[PDB]
Amino acid sequence: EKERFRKAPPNYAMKKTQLLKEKAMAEDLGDQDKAKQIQDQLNELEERAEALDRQRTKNISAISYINQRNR
Amino acid sequence: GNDLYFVKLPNFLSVEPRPFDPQYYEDEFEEEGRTRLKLKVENNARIVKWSDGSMSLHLGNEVFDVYKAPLQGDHNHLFIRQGTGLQGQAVFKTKLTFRPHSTD
Amino acid sequence: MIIPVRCFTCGKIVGNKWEAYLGLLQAEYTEGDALDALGLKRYCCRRMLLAHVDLIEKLLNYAPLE
Amino acid sequence: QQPMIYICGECHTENEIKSRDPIRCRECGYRIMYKKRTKRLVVFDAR
Ligand SMILES: [Zn+2]
Ligand SMILES: [Zn+2]
């Protein structure tokens, strides 16, 4: 009942959700389920990447810049 | 005009030997089925030459970076052998020596 | 894990110079000129920023929540 | 009247676990969970 109205991607269930969605898409021989899972996974990946880049936007982006510049 | 334009694509990027025409195409194919329909929809081609010297394949929104390997082990004289003359009237266009291997 | 507050051998404060060193290397500085600009003359203090590996950036990738 | 509060893992949500209870998170399902910091006095003579 708690998971019903509470969004799955909040907050640490992202990667586990990605793996579970990939398994669900793979386990289905129907094309509609595969396409829906692909779209959902793409949206979740985009959101998670944006969230991770926002968190690493400061103090980690700088050192990545200077590491690429170092090498 | 007469320049080597030889490319060697893998099984999952097999392009049609003829231009895409509505009278030569049909619907026969359907994670399991996602790699099946990609054979006859994404596979006309424009090999872009960049400033670094390398090339890439442009068959849609996705770009596959290719390398024109100059392999001197198969010095085959590629020719357009269409049947009009005595037997396969091969036209001497270019000898295939460099194989470009595309990949994702 | 994190930049030491003081040079082990000297006692000179190098805790406020890791980020500045990283900035100077974000510029086109040669790795020695950054230390020279940061006022690090002794080689004992220079090794603090030369050899330091910042792992606290890798440990912060394991977010407890969010 | 302290219910021995734990912190979940994947969730990080405080859960009230008394004795004779299954160790699971109140939400989303988790069999791993840790304990909260003590309330005892933590004092370091920095040296
Ligand atoms: Zn020193
Ligand atoms: Zn649980």
Side-chain angles (χ1 to χ4, degrees), chain A residues 1-10 13 24 26 30 35 49 51 60-71, chain B residues 1-70 73 83 85 88 90 100, chain C, chain D:
Chain A
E1 293 169 12
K2 276 195 177 68
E3 60 80 20
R4 172 59 185 85
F5 300 92
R6 173 265 302 168
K7 56 186 292 298
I60 303 196
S61 58
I63 187 164
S64 52
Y65 306 161
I66 75 97
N67 277 318
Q68 81 166 110
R69 275 162 182 75
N70 271 330
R71 64 172 179 268
Chain B
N2 189 311
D3 181 304
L4 193 149
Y5 293 117
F6 204 78
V7 190
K8 207 168 187 173
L9 257 47
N11 263 325
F12 44 88
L13 313 176
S14 72
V15 179
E16 306 168 358
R18 295 179 297 179
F20 176 63
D21 296 63
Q23 63 275 8
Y24 288 121
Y25 187 82
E26 60 286 344
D27 182 8
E28 288 189 350
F29 287 174
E30 173 53 26
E31 183 177 355
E32 298 177 330
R34 195 168 181 176
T35 52
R36 308 184 70 259
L37 169 141
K38 189 170 181 292
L39 279 152
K40 57 188 290 186
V41 69
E42 185 271 339
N43 306 328
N44 204 337
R46 297 293 174 275
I47 300 87
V48 175
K49 196 188 183 187
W50 309 83
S51 53
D52 53 49
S54 56
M55 318 179 302
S56 300
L57 185 155
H58 296 64
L59 260 298
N61 58 334
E62 175 53 28
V63 172
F64 300 85
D65 199 315
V66 79
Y67 299 95
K68 54 176 293 185
Chain C
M1 280 195 287
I2 190 173
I3 186 71
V5 175
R6 308 214 186 196
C7 176
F8 299 132
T9 313
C10 179
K12 183 175 167 61
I13 285 82
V14 310
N16 56 345
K17 297 182 170 58
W18 174 241
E19 305 300 337
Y21 173 79
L22 288 176
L24 271 72
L25 265 57
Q26 188 177 315
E28 298 180 23
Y29 278 69
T30 174
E31 190 174 318
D33 285 0
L35 305 160
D36 187 357
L38 291 168
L40 300 184
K41 297 293 104 178
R42 288 175 286 273
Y43 58 92
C44 71
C45 298
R46 287 165 135 259
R47 96 186 189 274
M48 301 298 300
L49 287 174
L50 282 162
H52 172 65
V53 66
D54 209 19
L55 278 159
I56 181 159
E57 304 303 336
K58 280 276 190 64
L59 273 56
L60 287 167
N61 286 16
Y62 303 107
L65 53 153
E66 282 102 357
Chain D
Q1 307 269 19
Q2 291 298 95
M4 186 46 53
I5 198 159
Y6 294 152
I7 306 172
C8 180
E10 36 268 33
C11 306
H12 320 88
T13 64
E14 276 71 353
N15 315 138
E16 308 297 351
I17 305 292
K18 284 80 72 175
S19 307
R20 308 300 183 180
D21 294 336
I23 276 88
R24 296 192 65 191
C25 186
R26 290 294 99 86
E27 72 191 51
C28 125
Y30 295 90
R31 310 302 169 92
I32 321 276
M33 42 172 51
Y34 310 91
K35 282 195 66 172
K36 237 180 155 187
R37 293 187 61 106
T38 191
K39 303 293 168 62
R40 296 291 179 87
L41 201 66
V42 175
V43 159
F44 301 107
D45 192 296
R47 64 185 57 240

